[PDB]
Design a protein around this nucleic acid. Structure first.
Ligand code: MG
Ligand code: MG
Ligand code: MG
Ligand code: MG
Ligand code: MG
Ligand code: MG
Ligand code: MG
Ligand code: MG
Ligand code: MG
Ligand code: MG
Ligand code: MG
Ligand code: MG
Ligand code: MG
Ligand code: MG
Ligand code: MG
Ligand code: MG
Ligand code: MG
Ligand code: MG
Ligand code: MG
Ligand code: MG
Ligand code: MG
Lengths: 37, 185, 43, 144
RNA sequence: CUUUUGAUGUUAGGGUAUUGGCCUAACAUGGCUAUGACGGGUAACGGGGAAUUAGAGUUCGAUUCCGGAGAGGGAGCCUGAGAAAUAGCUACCACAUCUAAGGAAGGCAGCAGGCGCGUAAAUUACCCAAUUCUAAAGAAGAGAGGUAGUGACAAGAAAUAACAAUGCAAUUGUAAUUGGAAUGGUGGGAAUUUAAAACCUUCCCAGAGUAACAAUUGGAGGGCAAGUCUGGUGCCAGCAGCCGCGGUAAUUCCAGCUCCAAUAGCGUAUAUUAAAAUUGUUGCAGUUAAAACGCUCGUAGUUGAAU
RNA sequence: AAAAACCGUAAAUCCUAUCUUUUAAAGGAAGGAGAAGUCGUAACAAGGUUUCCGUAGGUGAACCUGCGGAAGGAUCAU
């Protein structure tokens, strides 16, 4: 998953929207862990 | 402590279990020489491979080298004494030409068959195993015995055998007994 | 939940006994018989 | 040049690269990782003993259709629980609620085999008698 | 990173069988480190060696010999040329034996043997005859050591017939029927062997015909050598390392017959080597299959014209 | 001889502080597998608004839009 990300030959979900979803979820996790420190 | 007497293996497996042509050749040889399994073919192959390896290593070596002279003379003498080379082909290149039938020809079974003295090769094997054969005033009952050059004129029946001038076996004497008590009753 | 069908077919098949004697050769004598059947008559 | 140093005093570089790059091989990393003594119910053994807890049936994969018979076993050695396949036609009827069984691997040491999903174990003995000698049905009878 | 409380050196002593921060007093500020110090891990005792490999290599070495360490866990001590000894002593921690209740006595990782642990391992036998050791040294003793018992760990040799006459297919085969030789396995007794038995050799007696004195373990779609034969089941039961088979005419399931493979042996599980030029020094690949840092400078490292 | 004192060699017990390994839990949030489920139709043809990259914002969901870039384009050309 380096330069081979976003490679499209099999009808999958877009790479950048998956990246955006992951970043949102990571932000929520960081907030949850901060609330407990 | 563990004992200091060691041991070694004498055979090796083919590494390719179901090859047709090798299997047919093995059956050829087994039927021709009257053997029991493939293990005997494989032991002879093992021995021949050792011989050939020594010969190859000696041949790659320099001429008029002491190692080559000593070990090559020893190996050639051993081979000619065994009855595998002969008289005009002692040159360390004829070692590489020895084939499986040549070694397989020196067994006591084959020798007992070829010198008359038995009606087949299976007869030859059964006679050796039943204490009927001598090799020079020593009684041998092992069919894989390899006969050396100066021992092949001394194969003959044993003095304790009914085929070699002794009393008859357990069947003859019981038949003769029954005949005696028949004729004296 | 449906494990009452176990061993169904093995218990369905009608039973047949073994056949009787027909003793086989062993060892060196068995290798001799094979050699005759495959090469002696085929020539 | 071809991407490597080739000099008479360049041994340290080659040694260190081969040391670092070996960890990308799956086989080497599987055999040399410290966690195998932990995430392995058999803990490096080839066989283990356990107590039968429950009989179950498992579905086969999509193109096939069957109900494969297995058991759930608690290991005596460490208390863990596993699932093992009972091979043969009517061999599940030879097993009772809590017997002692030997189980072994299933032939693909870390991997599932064929049609069953998520099963890596196989029963070989029950109640101190062989499953095969018991299926042959002409050799032995269960130790009552 | 080490150094307050010895870490690195100097001077003078103490101590030891001797040298030494080994220890004490004064003094100086040193010693190691990306060529990896200081730490963490090891299901790590080191070596002579072992397995597999054309040549390179990869993996193992508790265990016959050599060196090291220990005697439940630690620390002290006597005798003695030699011990920080443990079938020697003193104390604590843990475990545990007898008792008349005041007291006394313990250490199988020596040889047998038991419990527990587990996938995982033998006799509470005989002898100092050999190899050696100790002594007041032919003459005593030695679970050191040897001998047997148990023992499909591993290794070597090697039975389960052979031969005739007739009959029948192509000299031959035996598919078939008749008859006489040969021979161990087995039971009994001896000569020997051995400290004394026992085993191996050798000799005598009795002793094979369905020679019932009766060979097995896996397979028969392909890989991979060997049935498109006969019954049962009917996407169920099941098989199958991989591709796959099974839904009423299954060469693959359950059985009968017949064939193939190895054979007194043959299957299965886990680990490891070759196969793997799929770890590449010999010897890989990087436009598009996995993979050239966004770009330049730069120290260590590696490499450097001709005479 | 018993018994005391002192400088040493020092088992053991306790308190405190770290480090290592294993482990419980209301609740929260992922991934993989399965079953005829519900909703839409983003990709593959110019897929009916060419497809993608980086960054930022928004919406039940797949996604939409702004700024700069590429052709792996639907143009090697006036
Ligand atoms: Mg690429
Ligand atoms: Mg000082
Ligand atoms: Mg060692
Ligand atoms: Mg150990
Ligand atoms: Mg031992
Ligand atoms: Mg030692
Ligand atoms: Mg102990
Ligand atoms: Mg001590
Ligand atoms: Mg003791
Ligand atoms: Mg003690
Ligand atoms: Mg013991
Ligand atoms: Mg064992
Ligand atoms: Mg004297
Ligand atoms: Mg005496
Ligand atoms: Mg069949
Ligand atoms: Mg390999
Ligand atoms: Mg390789
Ligand atoms: Mg190679
Ligand atoms: Mg490659
Ligand atoms: Mg570039
Ligand atoms: Mg579109």
């Amino acid at each position: 998953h380096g330069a081979s990300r976003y490679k499209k030959s099999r009808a999958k979900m877009r790479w950048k929207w998956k990246k955006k979803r992951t970043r949102r979820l990571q932000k929520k996790r960081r907030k949850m862990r901060q609330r407990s420190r | 402590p563990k004992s200091y007497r060691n041991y070694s293996k004498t055979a090796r497996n083919p590494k390719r279990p179901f090859e047709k042509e090798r299997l047919d050749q093995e059956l050829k040889l087994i039927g021709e020489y009257g053997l029991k399994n493939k293990r005997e073919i494989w032991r002879v192959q093992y021995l021949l491979a050792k011989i050939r390896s020594a010969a190859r290593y000696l041949l790659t070596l320099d001429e008029k080298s002491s190692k080559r002279i000593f070990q090559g003379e020893a190996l050639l003498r051993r081979m000619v004494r065994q009855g595998l080379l002969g008289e005009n082909e002692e040159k360390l290149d004829y070692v590489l030409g020895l084939t499986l039938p040549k070694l397989l020809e020196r067994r006591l079974q084959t020798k007992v068959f070829k010198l008359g003295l038995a009606k087949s090769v299976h007869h030859a094997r059964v006679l050796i195993r039943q204490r009927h054969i001598r090799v020079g005033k020593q009684m041998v009952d092992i069919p894989s015995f390899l006969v050396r050059v100066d021992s092949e004129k001394h194969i003959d029946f044993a003095t304790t055998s009914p085929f070699g001038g002794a009393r008859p076996g357990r069947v003859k004497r019981k038949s003769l007994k029954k005949q005696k008590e028949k004729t004296e009753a | 939940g449906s494990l009452a069908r176990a061993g169904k077919v093995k218990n369905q098949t009608p039973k047949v006994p073994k056949l009787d004697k027909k003793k086989r050769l062993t060892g060196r004598a068995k290798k001799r018989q094979l050699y005759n059947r495959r090469f002696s008559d085929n020539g | 040049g071809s991407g490597k140093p080739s000099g008479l005093r360049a041994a340290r570089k080659l040694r260190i690269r081969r040391r670092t790059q070996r960890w990308a091989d799956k086989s080497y990393k599987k055999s040399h990782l410290g966690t195998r003594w932990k995430s392995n119910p058999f803990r490096g053994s080839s066989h283990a003993k356990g107590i039968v807890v429950e009989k179950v049936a498992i579905e086969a994969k999509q193109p096939n259709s069957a109900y494969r018979k297995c058991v759930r076993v608690q290991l005596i050695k460490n208390g863990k629980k596993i699932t093992a396949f009972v091979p043969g036609d009517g061999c599940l009827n030879f097993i009772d609620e809590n017997d002692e069984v030997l189980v072994s691997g299933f032939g693909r040491s870390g991997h599932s085999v064929g049609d069953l999903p998520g099963v890596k174990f196989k029963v070989v003995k029950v109640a101190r008698v062989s499953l095969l000698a018991l299926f042959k049905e002409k050799k032995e009878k269960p130790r009552s």
